[PDB]
Amino acid sequence: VAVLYQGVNCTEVPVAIHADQLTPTWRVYSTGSNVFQTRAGCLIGAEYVNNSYECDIPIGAGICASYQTSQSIIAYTMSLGAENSVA
Amino acid sequence: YSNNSIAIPTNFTISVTTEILPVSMTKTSVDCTMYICGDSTECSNLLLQYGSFCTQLKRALTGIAVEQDKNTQEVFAQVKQIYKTPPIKYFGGFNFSQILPDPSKPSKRSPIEDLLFNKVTLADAGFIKDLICAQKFKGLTVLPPLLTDEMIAQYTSALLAGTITSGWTFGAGPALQIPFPMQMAYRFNGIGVTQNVLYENQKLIANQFNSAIGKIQDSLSSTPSALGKLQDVVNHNAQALNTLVKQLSSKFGAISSVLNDIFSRLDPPEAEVQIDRLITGRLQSLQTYVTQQLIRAAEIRASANLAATKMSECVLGQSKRVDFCGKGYHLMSFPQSAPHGVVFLHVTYVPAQEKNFTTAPAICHDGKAHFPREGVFVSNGTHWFVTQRNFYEPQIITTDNTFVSGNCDVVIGIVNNTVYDPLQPELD
Amino acid sequence: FKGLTVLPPLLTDEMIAQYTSALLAGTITSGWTFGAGPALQIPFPMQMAYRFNGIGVTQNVLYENQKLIANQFNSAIGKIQDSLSSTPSALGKLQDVV
Amino acid sequence: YSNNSIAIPTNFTISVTTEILPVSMTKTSVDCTMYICGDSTECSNLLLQYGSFCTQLKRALTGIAVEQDKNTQEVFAQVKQIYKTPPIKYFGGFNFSQ
Amino acid sequence: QSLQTYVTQQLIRAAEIRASANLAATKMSECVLGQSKRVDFCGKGYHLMS
Ligand SMILES: *[C@@H]1O[C@H](CO)[C@@H](O[C@@H]2O[C@H](CO)[C@@H](O)[C@H](O)[C@H]2NC(C)=O)[C@H](O)[C@H]1NC(C)=O
Ligand SMILES: *[C@@H]1O[C@H](CO)[C@@H](O[C@@H]2O[C@H](CO)[C@@H](O)[C@H](O)[C@H]2NC(C)=O)[C@H](O)[C@H]1NC(C)=O
Ligand SMILES: *[C@@H]1O[C@H](CO)[C@@H](O[C@@H]2O[C@H](CO)[C@@H](O)[C@H](O)[C@H]2NC(C)=O)[C@H](O)[C@H]1NC(C)=O
Ligand SMILES: *[C@@H]1O[C@H](CO)[C@@H](O[C@@H]2O[C@H](CO)[C@@H](O)[C@H](O)[C@H]2NC(C)=O)[C@H](O)[C@H]1NC(C)=O
Ligand SMILES: *[C@@H]1O[C@H](CO)[C@@H](O[C@@H]2O[C@H](CO)[C@@H](O)[C@H](O)[C@H]2NC(C)=O)[C@H](O)[C@H]1NC(C)=O
Ligand SMILES: *[C@@H]1O[C@H](CO)[C@@H](O)[C@H](O)[C@H]1NC(C)=O
Ligand SMILES: *[C@@H]1O[C@H](CO)[C@@H](O)[C@H](O)[C@H]1NC(C)=O
Ligand SMILES: *[C@@H]1O[C@H](CO)[C@@H](O)[C@H](O)[C@H]1NC(C)=O
Ligand SMILES: *[C@@H]1O[C@H](CO)[C@@H](O)[C@H](O)[C@H]1NC(C)=O
Ligand SMILES: *[C@@H]1O[C@H](CO)[C@@H](O)[C@H](O)[C@H]1NC(C)=O
């Protein structure tokens, strides 16, 4: 899974979910790695890449997420279509 | 009115008009256990009775939120190729610099999209979190749209580039290029005027179009009521949220509106009836909110379907439906983006300066009756000519203009004249 | 006496009649031209030729059958007059609102 | 059906038919304090403790009320010119008296 | 509760009437002020006038 916190700066999440008195299985999704900051909030558990594909699961504000190939969940910026020019 | 008098225009005018349409509304989210019981643990256990309602309200709001994104996608994302306009901007004398993107500005928006974006005043600028604070403290959230406002501008840019470089061919297959002054000739032929009218009045038509665009720009700034349709959406949503929030300071008959105050000062078995009174009141408030939102969402959906149809039929084609794409005879349209909506610019043809003539239905020449192929017979008092019906341009009557049918004993208002037969001088 | 009242509309029943009479006069004296610019007059039996030509029939078929078409049109109008009256409901779409 | 046969009409008919459409409904107004309570002064003071259950009803009903007028205007007020038909009612044999 | 039920029913009926009124306006524009080629829109047959 990946977790999205909708209104916080996940530099400052461990102080919002009160990460200190949670189960050691919830603390993996508080600081961890793969931290990424979006405009809708910010996201923990998914890796950001530089390719552009078409949307699979809409995260918001232009960002989408997917599961593909070792396997993991990736997040990316959706593409609008091919590029072309008339002569 | 008379029965042998006809009026024909000798002149024309190019007209540009606008049309505003809403597309989407604001997306919202709610959490009952925060809205109803705030931060009490005693009220949570009591609310846990009514455990099948909040699921239902949440489902309703989620459905609305997804439908908004679907609306926007249906309207704008019609074509899946990002065309570009050539770097040399010369299109036969027409001057599109007011609708094409402006690279100097940090946001690549055209000069008119800036006026549209400044004339609509919003509420929540920035989604990283005031009328947006207390709500968040009360359990109500506003979600950001999926397509940022710099993606919609790319879509409209693609549509404009395609239309002005290829015509209507890019909406029905692969794009095929064609010179612009030779596409306007096709459109003229499509509304019923021969195509040699354009090539002989080209520089007049270009000037009329440019002046019309200038007026469109100047007019929007004045009369600050053009954008009413798009401001009403914002006003409605803000007002609904304010009412919902402020509804939390009513007792609905209990002794107080503070949960801890009710729990203390009373013994449990009668404090619980007061608490249930409060809970029912707040649940009813939420349900009223959700019902009103559902009805408004239905209205917005009807509007968005209309906008999608106009995109398909006026921008990517040339319609013959009357008054669908503006007043006059439609020539062509251009889209522009606006907050929560879309704006269409319709370019149309209007006849200008008419004159009187006398007319007849047929001509009797040698016992035969001749009728026009594609025109109408007119007379200026002494001579008879044949002309096209939308623009005065007289010519001689010949066997190539007319066709024969029967004899001239049966038609009511037939008249006498001569038909030329353009073969005598060439052979003789 | 209980607190429920009805408000009057803005356009009276005598203004809507004026609007419809204007539409009819315009259409029968100028055709489709008055809806897309200034009104331009044209004889009526020379307007029907345009409309026939528009549905795919040559325009001499009208000028050679004009008096038959006139009678057929008149008879059809009379039948409308009779049928609207002597059918049972015919208007249940507007009665339902009330 | 066959592969070298065709049928072509030799005559015609002019048909007139009708179509009915609703355009608007009735405009209503309601007064809570007289519907719910009536002429009782003790009732109103108890009713005040519900935050706003009549401001909302009033707004809803007023929205409906103005929407009806917008509907009628959009349907009928197409052309802002009042044309009239000439005094002599001869239109080539067609009879528009009805 | 009685009043709220009344108002909700009114809102829904108003929406339906509005859909009908929009249809009527389109028919006015396209059948009366012009000549239509859409099939079975302006009556059954080949449209001449309305
Ligand atoms: C047809 O209409 C056009 C529209 O103006 C007329 O063009 C104007 O005509 C004269 C000729 O120079 C000037 O008053 C104006 O400069 C023209 N327009 C512009 C924008 O400059 C044209 O003259 C009309 N044709 C006839 C025969 O009347
Ligand atoms: C196309 O339209 C634009 C907008 O009116 C014209 O730009 C103006 O043209 C000159 C050039 O500086 C000046 O009169 C104005 O200052 C310009 N305005 C702006 C905002 O740049 C343009 O000239 C028109 N045609 C061409 C060929 O440029
Ligand atoms: C009606 O129009 C015709 C065609 O223009 C006019 O006849 C021509 O008038 C011109 C005017 O200079 C003469 O030079 C020509 O000799 C006439 N025709 C021919 C074939 O020679 C006619 O004068 C017009 N009538 C009125 C009353 O204006
Ligand atoms: C058109 O010409 C025909 C034949 O040239 C005219 O038909 C004759 O009209 C005269 C009236 O002046 C009658 O006396 C004859 O009986 C008609 N038939 C003939 C001569 O065969 C016809 O009148 C002319 N159309 C007009 C004047 O509008
Ligand atoms: C046009 O239609 C009207 C309506 O049918 C005709 O009016 C009738 O005329 C006859 C002959 O005078 C009377 O007996 C009927 O009573 C009239 N009907 C009505 C309803 O008044 C009219 O004659 C037709 N023709 C013309 C030229 O108006
Ligand atoms: C979140 O807060 C930090 C505070 O150090 C700030 O630097 C950062 O820009 C904030 N996030 C966003 C998206 O602005
Ligand atoms: C993505 O691209 C940026 C520059 O375009 C680069 O600095 C960054 O390292 C890249 N990241 C990944 C994960 O490829
Ligand atoms: C047509 O001619 C008549 C003759 O008097 C005149 O009154 C009328 O104004 C003319 N129409 C136009 C449009 O010039
Ligand atoms: C028409 O269809 C069938 C063929 O199976 C038969 O009637 C006849 O052979 C065909 N005629 C022609 C000209 O193809
Ligand atoms: C059918 O054709 C006949 C002969 O042409 C004629 O009566 C008319 O055209 C048609 N019938 C009717 C009743 O109009």
Coordinates of N, CA and C and ligand atoms in Angstrom, one line a residue, chain B residues 379-385 392 396, ligand 3:
Chain B
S379 N -35.5 41.8 -62.0 CA -35.6 42.9 -63.0 C -35.4 44.2 -62.4
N380 N -34.6 45.1 -63.0 CA -34.4 46.5 -62.5 C -35.2 47.5 -63.3
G381 N -36.4 47.1 -63.9 CA -37.3 48.0 -64.5 C -37.3 47.8 -66.0
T382 N -36.2 47.4 -66.6 CA -36.0 47.3 -68.1 C -35.5 46.0 -68.6
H383 N -34.6 45.3 -67.8 CA -34.0 44.1 -68.3 C -34.1 43.0 -67.2
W384 N -34.0 41.8 -67.6 CA -34.1 40.6 -66.8 C -32.8 39.9 -66.6
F385 N -32.4 39.6 -65.4 CA -31.2 38.9 -65.1 C -31.4 37.8 -64.1
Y392 N -26.1 40.1 -54.3 CA -26.5 40.6 -55.6 C -25.4 40.6 -56.6
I396 N -26.5 37.3 -67.4 CA -27.4 37.1 -68.5 C -28.1 35.8 -68.4
Ligands
LIG3 C1 -31.7 48.4 -65.6 O1 -30.5 47.7 -65.7 C2 -30.0 47.7 -67.1 C3 -28.7 46.9 -67.0 O2 -27.6 47.7 -66.4 C4 -29.8 49.0 -67.7 O3 -29.5 48.9 -69.1 C5 -28.2 49.3 -69.3 O4 -28.0 50.6 -68.8 C6 -26.6 51.0 -69.0 C7 -26.3 52.1 -68.1 O5 -25.2 52.9 -68.6 C8 -26.5 51.3 -70.5 O6 -25.2 51.7 -70.8 C9 -26.8 50.0 -71.3 O7 -26.9 50.3 -72.7 C10 -28.1 49.3 -70.8 N1 -28.1 47.9 -71.3 C11 -27.7 47.6 -72.6 C12 -27.7 46.2 -72.9 O8 -27.2 48.4 -73.3 C13 -31.1 49.9 -67.5 O9 -30.8 51.2 -67.9 C14 -31.5 49.9 -66.1 N2 -32.8 50.6 -65.9 C15 -33.0 51.6 -65.0 C16 -34.4 52.2 -65.0 O10 -32.1 51.9 -64.3

